[PDB]
Symmetry: C2
Subunit: 105 residues, 2 copies
């Protein structure tokens, strides 16, 4: 439920020359995850308008089991392997939501 | 609709000695905004577990008119004035969602 969801921010810097390829892989992998995995509650990615190769993803998983299952999926594998040479920085920020379970209108 | 929503990340660093007071003001202001303003679609605040005085808020407004109305409200005023001496850094990052209108499950 809301009280044990794993919430994380991923902050990524992508090689500017590979940004189109990266976005193609990322968008597909998010779409498949949202479609197929009940434990993936959101993968909400945004690109900074001033620096479009700086992407932040708000990640909410039902629990750590859901997260571990997610990173074993073929769709996550395709993304992780496909983009390995495109990522310049990856920051993984575990976080606590101020209002657990707050949803978008 | 999804295609003209104003999406922004606010990254804030709060004076560590004022963090409890800050969170009280922030949580109240988010709760009131979500309750009262149809144009505030989400204010999803998280605190970094390693550095709890580092807060990131995913902000989604229906449009720029909704945002301008929000910052004129008495509840936003109370928060902005109440926390003015507690904020050490404020970064306002306009952003483009990769999947406009994606919602949390
Ligand atoms: Ca849960
Ligand atoms: Ca390069
Ligand atoms: Ca809109
Ligand atoms: Ca201090």
């Amino acid at each position: 439920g809301a009280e044990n969801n794993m919430v994380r921010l991923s902050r990524i810097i992508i090689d500017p020359e590979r940004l189109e390829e990266y976005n193609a892989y990322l968008k597909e992998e998010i779409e498949v995850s949202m479609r197929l995995e009940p434990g993936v509650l959101v993968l909400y990615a945004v690109a900074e308008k001033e620096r479009p190769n700086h992407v932040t993803i708000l990640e909410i998983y039902a629990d750590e089991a859901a997260y571990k299952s997610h990173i074993a999926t073929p769709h996550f594998k395709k993304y992780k392997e496909g983009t390995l040479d495109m990522v310049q920085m990856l920051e993984l920020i575990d976080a606590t939501p101020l209002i657990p379970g707050l949803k978008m209108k």
